[PDB]
Design a protein around this ligand. Structure first.
Ligand SMILES: Nc1nc2c(ncn2[C@@H]2O[C@H](COP(=O)(O)OP(=O)(O)O)[C@@H](O)[C@H]2O)c(=O)[nH]1
Ligand SMILES: [Mg+2]
Lengths: 192, 178
């Protein structure tokens, strides 16, 4: 594998991301809707056989997103780490916006760079999805809800629900911060 | 007055939350956000009986598979949903929802529900499904499926036009009372 192995960016991730960016960003409910289970399962089996020899155009776009999220959830350790789990949560528990944000980014420099590579690629992807919210209907908030359990994992799971909302807020803020920093970089490029 | 717990499940964006809110609040939500966990209450009258229906809303995403069963204890009836405009979500009924529900809710009556009834002959819908050689679910497929999985019954509805929304919840209530 391919799938469920230790995590520049893993070729399976990149291949999946690049296709969705090229093809999926106008699809209503991208990452919200699931694929057919069997068609999803066949795509996952195919990406164990010949990862580069897979013609993704032969698969439905929600199967493709299904397999992407399945990859993230099958990593040995979650993308954001077991170690930093507690610190992301606390970053979110801070009282006001800018220091939650400052703490979260402070936690991020503590990641092993292989986790940081895949994670920033994924966050960039999600930024592109949200920039087209007008077409696909996916806000940063909606994406955060979906991806939060993919990216961070504790086990109770009772008040894991209480925790899930916090890691959702964490991911929602990352998407939003990256998105505004996009808006400003595009502005600054035309300047001076 | 009799208290029964209903839990609703089904693929993401197949209209669970609209179904629940339209029955309880007679209103149709406009915000596009996925549910993680919510609760509503609806009062209902069937066969001269007065029932308070606790409505437990859940997430349809696989990503919430570890968390969703927290909703299942003490359920008196299940609404298991797919969307008429999505053959994929009907496919996931016997493959994913039936095993999860029969496992956490054994002996609990299941009403299979085809949502978004207004879309079966909607033109934009059939256009989009035809692009992938699919068509809306035919009532037959829905009804057949309910037999395959051993549902208490098959209802179709459209939350948006309210067509059938009522009958869904009486079937469910009558299922629960027994
Ligand atoms: N045409 C139509 N659209 C619906 C209906 N019910 C829900 N929707 C739309 O389907 C999308 C998701 O509905 P929602 O209840 O949030 O799905 P849930 O994720 O299963 O809870 C939203 O765009 C709704 O407006 C319906 O009966 N008919
Ligand atoms: Mg919902």
């Amino acid at each position: 594998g391919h799938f469920g192995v230790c995590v520049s960016v893993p070729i399976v991730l990149e291949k999946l991301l690049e296709h969705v960016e090229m093809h999926g960003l106008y699809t209503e409910g991208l990452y919200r809707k699931s694929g057919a289970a069997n068609r999803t399962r066949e795509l996952r089996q195919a990406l164990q056989t010949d990862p580069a020899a897979v013609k993704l155009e032969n698969f439905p776009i929600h199967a493709i997103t299904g397999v992407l999220k399945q990859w993230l959830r099958e990593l040995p350790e979650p993308l954001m780490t077991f170690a930093q789990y507690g610190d992301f949560l606390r970053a979110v528990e801070l009282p006001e916006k800018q220091e939650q944000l400052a703490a979260i980014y402070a936690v991020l420099e503590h990641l092993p760079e292989a986790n940081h590579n895949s994670l920033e690629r994924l966050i960039f992807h999600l930024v592109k999805v949200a920039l087209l919210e007008d077409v696909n209907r996916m806000s940063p908030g909606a994406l955060a809800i979906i991806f939060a359990p993919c990216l961070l994992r504790c086990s109770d799971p009772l008040t894991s629900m209480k925790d899930v909302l916090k890691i959702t807020t964490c991911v929602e803020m990352l998407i939003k911060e990256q998105m505004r920093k996009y808006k400003v970089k595009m502005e600054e490029i035309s300047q001076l | 007055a009799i208290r029964k717990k209903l839990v609703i499940v089904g693929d993401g964006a197949c209209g669970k939350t609209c179904l629940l809110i339209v029955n309880s609040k007679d209103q149709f939500p406009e915000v596009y956000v996925p549910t993680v966990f919510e609760n509503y209450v609806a009062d209902i009258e069937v066969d001269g009986k007065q029932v308070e229906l606790a409505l437990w809303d859940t997430a349809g995403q696989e990503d919430y598979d570890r968390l969703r069963p927290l909703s299942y204890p003490d359920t008196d009836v299940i609404l298991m949903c797919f969307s008429i405009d999505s053959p994929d979500s009907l496919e996931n009924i016997p493959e994913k929802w039936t095993p999860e529900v029969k496992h956490f809710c054994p002996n609990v009556p299941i009403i299979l529900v085809g949502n978004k009834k207004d879309l079966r002959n909607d033109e934009h819908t059939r256009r989009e499904l035809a692009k992938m050689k699919q068509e809306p679910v035919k009532p037959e497929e829905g009804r057949d499926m309910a037999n395959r999985i051993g549902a208490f019954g098959y209802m179709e509805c459209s939350a948006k036009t309210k067509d059938g929304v009522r009958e869904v919840f009486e079937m469910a209530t009558r299922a629960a009372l027994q």
